[PDB]
Amino acid sequence: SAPRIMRLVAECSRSRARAGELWLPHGTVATPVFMPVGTQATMKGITTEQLDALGCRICLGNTYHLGLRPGPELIQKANGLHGFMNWPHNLLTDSGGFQMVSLVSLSEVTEEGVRFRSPYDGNETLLSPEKSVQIQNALGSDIIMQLDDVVSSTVTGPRVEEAMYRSIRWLDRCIAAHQRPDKQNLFAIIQGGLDADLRATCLEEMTKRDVPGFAIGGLSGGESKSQFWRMVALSTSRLPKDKPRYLMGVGYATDLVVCVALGCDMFDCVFPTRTARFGSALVPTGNLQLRKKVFEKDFGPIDPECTCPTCQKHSRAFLHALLHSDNTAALHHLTVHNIAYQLQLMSAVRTSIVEKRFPDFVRDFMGAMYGDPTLCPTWATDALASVGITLG
Ligand SMILES: Nc1nc2[nH]cc(CN[C@H]3C=C[C@H](O)[C@@H]3O)c2c(=O)[nH]1
Ligand SMILES: [Br-]
Ligand SMILES: [Br-]
Ligand SMILES: [Cl-]
Ligand SMILES: [Cl-]
Ligand SMILES: [K+]
Ligand SMILES: [Zn+2]
């Protein structure tokens, strides 16, 4: 009944890979899409303008870092979070509850919401589904995330089932609190941890609600890669095909390609930024460790196929010297490049899907990444074989 925000351009015959279009209030976004953090909280980070120049048409943004106390913040801006960020394209804004429960061990979770006491004076801050959705309505982001009860995937016990059912109840609360469904798209977040039955229950129950899209939560928490890819495959097997699948917290290139093969459409991770901080640059063969002296007299670019400004203007040797003379500017250049590599990777994946050659693409990618596609990690081989893709 409700209008679908996603159009399927193509689906490959073997895997679950999909190429599509998100039609959002600030423009169309090609999927599968990696979503960089547009929030400027980092002193060392790429700017919104450079993201626009790279071709990024949707990024992540929250106001958790602003203000006086921890939690999401109203900004009291006439143009909302888009005006605050000077961003003409699409924004995805999480609830802020994940950061509130992860960054502060003092914060506690009750059915009423996420509770915190002031570090300075013990002031009590409560983030309820109602408050989360009201803040997100004021911010005006294009896609807003349900407030959910997040538990560590390493945790086992009744707490997992408790959080799953609480996430369902909070999904209903957020749906009810959500004004402006004509301008913002609320996504549910599938919970259940590594328990197949709990996650299957969460799938069956959450897909009963007519929300524009669905996300897969509680993965990439230190769980085994077997459990990770099995949970992803379960989720996408039971999520509707005419709506987006957003897998939160995965940025490794191999994980991206594999989870595209499993049916995921949207991704996010701060991995490119962290990789840059080690003096490392992402390439089809993995990463170049530019601090090493084998690049001292290497005057080629990071990647002669890369279209990013760093590869247009600077060489490996310049970056190698800059890492040891001005680590910060080198970090900025490597950040630009790694984000451009993530975008270039997603674009090439989508192109391979549209041209009906995705399995050959995966084979080439694994060969370049690991030497020969049969040297691919065992978990990725299992995952790919589960949806009809064999290597070599
Ligand atoms: N709102 C929300 N934001 C998120 N970002 C990343 C996740 C990924 N799941 C995290 C939660 C527990 C697991 O150990 C993993 O570390 C996520 C979520 O599950 N919910
Ligand atoms: Br990023
Ligand atoms: Br040079
Ligand atoms: Cl809704
Ligand atoms: Cl060396
Ligand atoms: K805050
Ligand atoms: Zn580059």
Residue numbers in the entry: 12 to 403
Provide excerpts from the study.
In contrast to the homodimeric architecture of the bacterial and archeal TGT, the eukaryotic, heterodimeric TGT is composed of a catalytically active queuine tRNA-ribosyltransferase subunit 1 (QTRT1) and a catalytically inactive QTRT2 subunit. Here we report the first crystal structure of the human QTRT1, which is the catalytic subunit of a eukaryotic TGT enzyme. Analysis of the human QTRT1 catalytic subunit reveals the enzyme to possess a bended (α/β) barrel, consisting of an eight stranded β-barrel at the core and eight flanking helices. In addition, the protein contains a Zn2+ binding domain, in which the zinc ion is coordinated by a triangular arrangement of three cysteine residues Cys317, Cys319, and Cys322, while the α-helix bound His248 completes the tetragonal coordination of the metal ion.
